């Protein structure tokens, strides 16, 4: 193949706003000035599959209307949605469907053999179509779903070779097709001496000048060269003599050195999630998990997680932070009693069985256990405290069983009338509603102190390259 230079071509209208005698700075997807576009020439056939990254600037030095359509798609094998645009002689057929394209689709509908169901079809009559040569520039973009197509027709006087003209041509918006199917590749459709200059778009900032009629006369790329930045940073197409500050030369990083500690043993998250039935509420099992590699991802397959709320940290991004010492507190509660396990919320369990501090920085996770911790007999093997004198202190376990006094009579340990027992049992029946079903709840409390961290996620540590500007990703410092 060959390559040509884009002499400041591919500047369409960013929005649908009319402006005159202004200098507008837009930040849309355009074609960079003086770029290296492809020069696929067809005399020999040339119709290869080209990637669709962000946008396509398809030029056409065309005679007798050789190129007559386009095909966009991801797989192009009748397994994913694909867009087909044809223009035979009189109209443009634009349809997104599930066609089966052959190895070399060309134009007598030979480009496909099967036609599945479609949900969109446009026959917008206007066909988008011998002294001078024809130049048919088309900008195809897929932003916010709607497939935008900009078109521009130009009479070009053929020079010595076949080189893109050196001039400005503002492309006019054509359609606003309601699309959004994934599109990553495309191909052209010819009809059996022409050539196209398909290019690729990328984000950039352009300074556009509007005349008194509202048509863009020229453009500045604000990133092509030193002077262009000076013109943009000064909002003027003509800069005077002097020195101007435009930007800052910041050296970009090279790599992403991690340098995490030397920890290989897997985290004991299996004996606290796939253990025996469970522990009780007033005797929640607390275990210190130190010197481990906490892979929370495995916690999503060994046990289906319901609403996951983390206080102080985000639910994700837990594999790149290394805590010092974590504590797992496991117990079982009712369905409606899961709201009380939270900093600030009160109730029956939040003040008598398990209280979280107001500055709790950790993750609580509860999941229904109506399949393993239930049976049709009356589930009375889980106890909880209902009566106590004062509220439970944050992170404190009450193992005592002193009798409760609800009146003024000196019971002195009789456990009868007005001397209700402080510990009662639940009732987990498989026929009750979801509000009364048992839920296993584990609270992972983290600690971030000035100490060598010993529990992080599964991130492979890299080598230490010095004397180079790199991205450091230490235990708690990025």
């Amino acid at each position, epitope marked *: 193949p060959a390559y040509t230079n884009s002499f400041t071509r591919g500047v369409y209208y960013p929005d649908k706003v009319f402006r005159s005698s202004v200098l507008h700075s837009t930040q849309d997807l355009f074609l960079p000035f003086f770029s290296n576009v492809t020069w696929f020439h067809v005399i020999r056939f040339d119709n290869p599959v080209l990637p669709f990254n962000d946008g396509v600037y398809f030029a056409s030095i065309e005679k007798s209307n050789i190129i007559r359509g386009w095909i966009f798609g991801t797989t192009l094998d009748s397994k994913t949605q694909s867009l087909l645009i044809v223009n035979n002689a009189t109209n443009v057929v634009i349809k997104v469907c599930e066609f089966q394209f052959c190895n070399d689709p060309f134009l007598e509908f030979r480009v496909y053999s099967s036609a599945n169901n479609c949900t969109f079809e446009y026959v917008s009559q206007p066909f988008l179509m011998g002294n001078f040569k024809n130049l048919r520039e088309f900008v195809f973009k897929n932003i916010d779903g709607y497939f935008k197509i900009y078109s521009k027709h130009t009479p070009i006087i053929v020079r010595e070779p076949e080189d893109l003209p050196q001039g400005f041509s503002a492309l006019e918006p054509l359609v606003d097709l309601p699309i959004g199917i994934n599109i990553t590749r495309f191909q052209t459709l010819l009809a059996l001496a022409a050539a196209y200059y398909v290019g690729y778009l990328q984000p950039r900032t352009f300074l556009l000048k509007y005349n008194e009629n509202g048509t863009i006369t020229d453009a500045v790329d604000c990133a092509l060269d030193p002077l262009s930045e000076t013109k943009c940073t000064l909002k003027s197409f003509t800069v005077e003599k002097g020195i101007y500050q435009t930007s800052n030369f910041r050296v970009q990083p090279t790599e992403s050195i991690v340098r995490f500690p030397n920890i290989t043993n897997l985290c004991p998250f299996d004996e606290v999630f796939n253990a025996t039935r469970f522990a009780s509420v007033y005797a929640w099992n607390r275990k210190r998990i130190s010197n481990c590699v906490a892979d929370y991802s495995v916690l999503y397959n060994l046990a289906p997680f319901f609403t996951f709320k983390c206080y102080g940290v985000s639910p994700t991004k837990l594999n790149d932070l290394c805590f010092t010492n974590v504590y797992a507190d496991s117990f079982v509660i009712r369905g*409606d009693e899961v*709201r*009380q396990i939270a900093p600030g*919320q*009160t*109730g029956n369990i939040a003040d008598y069985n398990y209280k979280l501090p107001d500055d709790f920085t950790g993750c609580v996770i509860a999941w229904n256990s109506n399949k393993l911790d239930s049976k049709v007999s009356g589930n009375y093997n889980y106890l909880y405290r209902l*009566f106590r004198k004062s509220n439970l202190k944050p992170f404190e376990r009450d193992i005592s069983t002193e009798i409760y006094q*609800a*009146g003024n009579k000196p019971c002195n340990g009789v456990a009868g009338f*007005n001397c*209700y027992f402080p510990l009662r049992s639940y009732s987990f029946r498989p026929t009750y*509603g979801v*509000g009364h079903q048992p839920y296993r709840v584990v609270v992972l409390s983290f600690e971030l102190l000035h100490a060598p961290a010993t529990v992080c996620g599964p991130k492979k540590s890299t080598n230490l390259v010095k004397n180079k500007c790199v991205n450091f990703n230490f235990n708690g410092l990025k």
Partner: nanobody, 119 residues
Framework: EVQLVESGGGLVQPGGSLRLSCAAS????????MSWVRQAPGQGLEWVST????????YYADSVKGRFTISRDNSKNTLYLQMNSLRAEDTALYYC?????????????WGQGTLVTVS
């Protein structure tokens, strides 16, 4: 040794009524305090009303002053809750509780509960 039995409906039209009958058994309901505690899905428990057993005065909450009424019977130990003027914001799980006025602030023990839907 002491239990509670509740009854009622499971679905009410948003604008109709429902017959709620809490049926206690073997209680000292003469000087005890029996009331209802609602449990809306998504939040905790809320107090609805209260029925004094010493004098017989019935107290209501702030938003249920002119839409609820309670009838206490001492012949067969049953209570009637005639809920009127219902809308889509009354979805809650009702619990028939009973406590002793000459004791602590929290109730002694609750029942099994009844679920109603209004939307």
């Amino acid at each position: 040794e002491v239990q509670l039995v509740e009854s009622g409906g499971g679905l009410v039209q948003p604008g109709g009524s429902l017959r709620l009958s809490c049926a206690a058994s073997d209680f000292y309901f003469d000087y005890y305090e029996m009331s209802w505690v609602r449990q809306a899905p998504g939040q905790g428990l809320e107090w609805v009303s209260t029925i004094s057993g010493l004098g017989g005065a019935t107290y209501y909450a702030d938003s249920v002053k002119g839409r609820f009424t309670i009838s206490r019977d001492n012949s067969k130990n049953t209570l009637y809750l005639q809920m009127n003027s219902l809308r889509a914001e009354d979805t809650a799980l009702y619990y028939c509780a009973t406590r002793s006025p000459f004791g602590d602030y929290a109730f002694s023990y609750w029942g099994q509960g009844t679920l109603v839907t209004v939307s």
